[PDB]
A paper describes a structure:
The crystal structure of CGS from M. ulcerans is presented covalently linked to the cofactor pyridoxal phosphate (PLP). Covalently bound at the intersection between the two monomers is the PLP-Lys208 moiety. PLP binds tightly to Lys208 with a covalent-bond length ranging between 1.3 and 1.4 Å. A similar series of sulfates are found in the MetB–PLP structure; however, there is no evidence for the presence of HEPES or any other ligand bound in the four active sites. The only noted change is seen in a loop consisting of residues 350–362, in which the disordered loop in the MetB–PLP structure becomes partially ordered in the MetB–PLP–HEPES structure. 4-succinyl-l-homoserine, l-cysteine, l-cystathionine, succinate and combinations of products and reactants proved unsuccessful, showing only the presence of the PLP covalently bound in the active site.
CGS is a transferase and acts in the committed step (the fifth overall) of the biosynthesis of l-methionine. MetB is covalently linked to the cofactor pyridoxal phosphate (PLP), similar to other members of the aspartate aminotransferase (AAT-I) superfamily of enzymes. Similar to other CGS enzymes, MetB forms a homotetramer, with each individual homodimer creating two active sites. Here, we present two structures of the cystathionine γ-synthase MetB from M. ulcerans covalently linked to PLP and bound to the buffer molecule HEPES.
Residue numbers in the entry:
A (entry chain C): 12 to 350, 362 to 388
B (entry chain D): 11 to 352, 357 to 387
C (entry chain A): 12 to 352, 355 to 388
D (entry chain B): 10 to 351, 357 to 388
The structure:
Amino acid sequence: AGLATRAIHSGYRPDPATGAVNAPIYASSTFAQDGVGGLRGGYEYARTGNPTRTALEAALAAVEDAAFGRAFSSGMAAADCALRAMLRPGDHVVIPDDAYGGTFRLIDKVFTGWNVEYTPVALADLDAVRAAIRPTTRLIWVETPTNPLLSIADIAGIAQLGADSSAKVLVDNTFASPALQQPLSLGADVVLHSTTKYIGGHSDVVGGALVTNDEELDQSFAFLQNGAGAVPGPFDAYLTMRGLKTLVLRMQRHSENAAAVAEFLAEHPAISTVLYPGLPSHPGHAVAARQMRGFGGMVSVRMRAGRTAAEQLCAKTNIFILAESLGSVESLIEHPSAMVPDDLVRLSVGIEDVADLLDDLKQALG
Amino acid sequence: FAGLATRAIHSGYRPDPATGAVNAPIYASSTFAQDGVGGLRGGYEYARTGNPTRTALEAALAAVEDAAFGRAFSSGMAAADCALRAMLRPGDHVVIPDDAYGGTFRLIDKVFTGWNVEYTPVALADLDAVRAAIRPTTRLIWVETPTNPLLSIADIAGIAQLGADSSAKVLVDNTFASPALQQPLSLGADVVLHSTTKYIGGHSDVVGGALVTNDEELDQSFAFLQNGAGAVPGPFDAYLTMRGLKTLVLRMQRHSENAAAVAEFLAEHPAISTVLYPGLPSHPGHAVAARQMRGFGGMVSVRMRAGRTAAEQLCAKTNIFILAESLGSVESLIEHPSAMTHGSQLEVPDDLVRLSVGIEDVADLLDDLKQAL
Amino acid sequence: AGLATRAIHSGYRPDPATGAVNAPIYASSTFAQDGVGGLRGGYEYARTGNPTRTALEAALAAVEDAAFGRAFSSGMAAADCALRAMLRPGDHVVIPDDAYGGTFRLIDKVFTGWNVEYTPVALADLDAVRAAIRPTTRLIWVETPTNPLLSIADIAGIAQLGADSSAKVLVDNTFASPALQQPLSLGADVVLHSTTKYIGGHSDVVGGALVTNDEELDQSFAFLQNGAGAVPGPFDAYLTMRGLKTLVLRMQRHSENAAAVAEFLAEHPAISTVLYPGLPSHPGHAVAARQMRGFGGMVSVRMRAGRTAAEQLCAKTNIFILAESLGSVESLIEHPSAMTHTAGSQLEVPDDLVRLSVGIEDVADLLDDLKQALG
Amino acid sequence: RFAGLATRAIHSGYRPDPATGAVNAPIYASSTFAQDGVGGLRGGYEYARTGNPTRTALEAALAAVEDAAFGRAFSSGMAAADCALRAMLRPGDHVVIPDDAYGGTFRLIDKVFTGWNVEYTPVALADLDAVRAAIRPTTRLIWVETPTNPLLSIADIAGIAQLGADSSAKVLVDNTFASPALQQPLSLGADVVLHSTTKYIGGHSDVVGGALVTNDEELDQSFAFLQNGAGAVPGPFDAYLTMRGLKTLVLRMQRHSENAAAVAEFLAEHPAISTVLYPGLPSHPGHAVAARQMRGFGGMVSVRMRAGRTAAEQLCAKTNIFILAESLGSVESLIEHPSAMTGSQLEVPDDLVRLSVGIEDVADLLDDLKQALG
Ligand code: NA
């Protein structure tokens, strides 16, 4: 029933042969068959399907209340599979005007070379999103909150627009995670995760996922999953599943720490603007409150005194680690314009003691 | 650093300065602390883009192909996908084998054709036919030798020259021969692909692929899609692949010796009509194979005189050869391609059985085949 | 500063060479040297010491405010090191009368063979613990809360006894974990963990730990760690470090869930007694409140209808998993009398008793699960 | 499954999974196992320390390769050793040991077990009269290594087996150096065999582990008790690497022997070297015993340096392919100076260099030594 219970129990059942409570790590690329009966348990070749990956996919689908899940070697590999499944030459995709840099690079630098067209739009503006839809638009790419601005898109709003013009709607739910948002229950066709971030939760596994309720779409994902082979190894799939078992607990403490950080930096005179979906003054706050169970562990701030203040905050923290990525138990900090306005610093607030995080920020700010 | 066994062990990772660790550590870190914004440690910033275990692996792979550049991927097919997309755009054409690896044929035909890439399959053994397949739009010639499962041979130098002459790149998928038996960059290939799943890993426990090249520009174009599409290996698997590669040379020698003994036995056996093995003087392309390969490999295929039934029975009744997909493993494997794999390619005969001969004691392998037959 | 912060940051600093934020898994048994004995970072052979294990030891030490940490292949291996380091033939150990079955079996079955004597005692009775001390008593073996009865021992109180008689005091701090109890701040000489339980947290790594401030005792431990070689591999060490990083967060939820499960069972008519340190009426509650930051994730209950009802509860849960071990994110249930061997030297585990390791699943679910399972 | 040793090492430890057909033993990272009703075990598994599926597969593999009925794996060679000694000895008992034992074995016996009132006597194992004369009424164990570290001296396993039978004393052989691929001590009357699987069996210097195998079901049960009771148990990833390494043991050992024989030949002709120790050399003390009981003469060569301790140090410093590091039995060549690295034991001469010859191309290893010797 509950999501924490599902993250722990839903996708791997203790083995019949040994009772092993955890999905074993099947470091096998191939599988014995029976000359009369053929495959055992449907397994033939690891790329196509393997037991550990099946467990992961079953858990990923479970926590998004999806019928189907697919796991990939990276969040970008999931995005690549989604783009390639749902677009062809001559098609168009609407994208966010502030999407994840890797997504933008992929679409602008790769897919445009393969005769896919795209228009970025401020997703908060539903009339703007609708105007950006052409006869050739097959796909609407939604991110919410966005990386790094934490801007909000009305998933339900956009799904309606998708339905109205026969465009599919994908929601990249990395930041929010299954613990905070369920885009399928709001109308999305497909949900994408970089499991590298919150689901893994420990900065130790690169991975990705696609989940959906649409069986034809799942089969189209599977075709590219097997065919172009951007698939996770079993130790990594195991680590991902491991992380997922604590996601709900973790995202609660991320969100509580992140509110405390945003409140501190709201009052701190070096900071001009705090970007956090929990704040009533944040644009999109109301939309966030309706579609999110909690407001996430991400906080971005714009520094009063500009780029140089931003660089110096990033270099002076002793708990927040200056590094790319986000969604880890250890707080991370970066300067996105370098690594977006150049005075913006992005904070992935971890699960450390809050008094420590607030003291680290105070001393770093001077 | 001079011989290939030596390089395979020593070239890919030097013992750590800070600890002296003799093996590449498994860096299960997705990200990497910086000193000031963009003050990278050792060039590392985000594991998809680059990471220390995968760098070690890429060094080892480049070294055993005597290549300046190596790229590792989550699978052989991810390596194929990256190459195709790096070297082709809509409108372009690729010459491929008429008996290509099935996953390669499926990707080009069922995926890339819908991205306005065109192809022509050819008997690669016939250089006039290969030449005649090249269009003004041909940017790529895709070579596999030996091919799967007929073990047909292509003249990698002869095909390099046809590529040079029409400004098409030549990729050689060297999975079957491995770096131990065949070095296609030395013969004029632009790029070599492996499935490291097979012989390089050698133990049927890590899926992975590789691209290697001496062309800096081409390496940069693969890097772009490596990072961009993120079909990247994890560090445990990258480690397994490297560990696998440290015995490649030794394993392949025993693989070839065992395969030659199996080929010999099956050539004398009443139930077999045809033995396909690159080392037999009567194998088509044997003399090419002899010129470009150091040994003739661990794959043997046969056609059963009594047809599909005989082939099915053999695969069912082995007790040491394992009925399974894949090849290149220390344990012998057996497949009936017509039953176990899925106009434009050659039809694999339904009386054909493919043997991946492993490193077991040869007497036991021969006795297994004898009783199975 | 804060313990959750320390669990995250204290025992591995991001790598100078690469910045890697996590302790790399160094699968190397050996280490290159710069001319003979020119060691690199002090490494020479994995069993003696290796980088991943050093990181784990540094984390383990940090979370208990200990200067020294040593990791082993299991909690039992940590226990065997501790006993072999601190005892010799003819020495004696005072032990809990309801100790963890593995500790008792190792002492009663193996060490008695090697001429070490023991006396079990009710650790809650400080006069009885003191009475059990002989001139040959070199060690007092404290466990709190106990497995499976959850009895409480006054650590500071026992530590004073050890000091008075020159006997070292070890606390098996497994159940409580570092998040809830800090025995070295209370006078223990050594703290033991099975990191197989709460610290790993995910039932996926078997491991043990001995932490201490006494550099001489740590060197005795190191001698046996190296010499008898019950050492963890580096993937396992990494998993244990990984679990540790969310211990503080998880223990909080185990303790909340467990409070709820205990109150629930306490009013259920199938249950005759609830054993939970948090309950005011639990013997040792005031002692536990003094020394523990929270009351833990374990609850044991006695069934009004006897052994058969206990077996039927264990068989009927669909969320609690019927399996040994404890301190996992998944709720585990068991019937401990069925794994006990003891008569006369250890308290009898009642056959109507069910032990529950309450996980971090949604509490409503877990209560629904007990409710349907009880009938 | 089943005939030749290379076949067994591949096929005997795990049959492909009935549920999935997985060709390799899965890594079961589970400390516990669900039951069907209380005591209703699945496959007999209940708690990983006591038994777990990946360890079971490794123990089957280890047993099969020594033609043993019973296998036990441990977290290191030294944990295998500590288990053996605690299983077979009690205070007041005595063990006869080699006078040039592996340094860890000697340290555990002399520095740990003497304090638990176990006594020992070191003896030249090659001299069967001296082994015999070392045996007391309290002698319950004779501890045999052959070849010995690092002098590569030989002991007559069968002959020492008969001395043990004569005096009701169990015989254990540390078969680490020879490995199952070259020496089968149970076939020669040993009661138990021990390995550091860290060395040849794993092969790749990437997994610490040990093993005890036996045909004696009673002995196995005494080891099981302490495996479980003391818990020096391997993790399942490490167990997996050990099983994977074992899959190429027979193949690697053949090369290691060929490479080492050539390294011995080269060194014997080289004027910087006064003595070459290699079991395969006709003039090696114990060569005909070694020829009798070993299928090949192994990967280890030790040499003494004419110019003494300093030339030993210099050779160890100057190799570029042989890596200066402890341990042995790796696909990469290793070199060490045991007197610096590693009256109750034979002094290892300070001029001695121990070479663990790997599977690199022989011509590169000879060139490496030739340039390092100057
Ligand atoms: Na665990």
